[PDB]
Design a protein around this ligand. Structure first.
Ligand SMILES: *[C@@H]1O[C@H](CO)[C@@H](O)[C@H](O)[C@H]1NC(C)=O
Ligand SMILES: *[C@@H]1O[C@H](CO)[C@@H](O)[C@H](O)[C@H]1NC(C)=O
Lengths: 50, 49
């Protein structure tokens, strides 16, 4: 809401599971620090240790 | 041409190990079968045939 009276409901939070026939998950391209444009970005919470 | 098409980047990931300076080096390598395939124009390789 960039102002007070701006109601919007279009952002959709999406989770998925890593399976090679459907969801290939790879590192970011180190030559560009940018995903190649036929791919999509994603994020994942990763802990440190025990 | 292989770098522009984003849907063929995987092969672009593989050719980085054998990008040769001159094609005559690739012809000499495939004559000794050091290589196995080489992407090049048609009439040049028909002349080599
Ligand atoms: C925590 O660190 C130890 C270091 O020896 C490692 O063996 C273990 O797998 C780590 N656990 C996690 C959850 O990262
Ligand atoms: C860290 O915690 C997980 C939780 O189940 C455990 O499976 C793993 O063995 C632990 N890492 C160790 C003890 O290095």
């Amino acid at each position: 809401s960039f102002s007070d009276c701006e109601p919007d409901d279009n952002h959709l939070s999406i989770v998925t599971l890593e399976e090679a026939p459907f969801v290939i998950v790879e590192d970011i391209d180190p030559l560009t620090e940018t995903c190649v444009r036929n791919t999509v970005p994603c994020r994942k919470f990763v802990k440190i240790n025990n | 041409y292989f770098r522009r098409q984003v849907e063929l980047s995987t092969m672009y990931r593989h050719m980085e190990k054998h990008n040769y300076e001159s094609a005559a080096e690739a012809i000499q390598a495939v004559r000794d079968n050091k290589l196995h395939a080489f992407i090049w124009d048609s009439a040049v390789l028909e002349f080599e045939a």
